[PDB]
Curated annotation (Swiss-Prot), chains A, B:
The lineage of its organism: Eukaryota, Metazoa, Chordata, Craniata, Vertebrata. HeLa cells lacking SH3GLB1 show dissociation of outer and inner mitochondrial membrane as well as abnormal mitochondrial morphology. Cells overexpressing SH3GLB1 lacking an N-terminal amphipathic helix show a similar phenotype. It comes from Homo sapiens (Human). Highly expressed in heart, skeletal muscle, kidney and placenta. Detected at lower levels in brain, colon, thymus, spleen, liver, small intestine, lung and peripheral blood leukocytes. This is Endophilin-B1. Belongs to the endophilin family. It comes from the Eukaryota. An N-terminal amphipathic helix, the BAR domain and a second amphipathic helix inserted into helix 1 of the BAR domain (N-BAR domain) induce membrane curvature and bind curved membranes. The SH3 domain is required and sufficient for the interaction with UVRAG. Homodimer, and heterodimer with SH3GLB2. Binds BAX; induction of apoptosis augments BAX binding. Binds DNM1, HTT, AMPH, BIN1 and ARFGAP1. Interacts with UVRAG; UVRAG bridges the interaction to BECN1 indicative for an association with the PI3K complex II (PI3KC3-C2). May be required for normal outer mitochondrial membrane dynamics. Required for coatomer-mediated retrograde transport in certain cells. May recruit other proteins to membranes with high curvature. May promote membrane fusion. Involved in activation of caspase-dependent apoptosis by promoting BAX/BAK1 activation. Isoform 1 acts proapoptotic in fibroblasts. Involved in caspase-independent apoptosis during nutrition starvation and involved in the regulation of autophagy. Activates lipid kinase activity of PIK3C3 during autophagy probably by associating with the PI3K complex II (PI3KC3-C2). It is found in: Cytoplasm; Golgi apparatus membrane; Mitochondrion outer membrane; Cytoplasmic vesicle, Autophagosome membrane.
């Protein structure tokens, strides 16, 4: 549980930095 | 053309590293 939430807190900022820079959050959030 | 293929060669490895790590390739590939 700690590993999956630790990787969720890693991949949430990756999703946010991906979706902000216009011109794996989902699976990690699912297991968490 | 060089900018779009340079960003395609950046985002293809991002798609591959996203899809390999189980448990924006498309738009960049489209413009390229």
């Amino acid at each position: 549980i700690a590993k999956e939430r630790k990787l969720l807190q890693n991949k949430r900022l990756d999703l946010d930095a991906a979706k902000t820079r216009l011109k794996e959050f989902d699976r990690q959030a699912e297991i968490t």
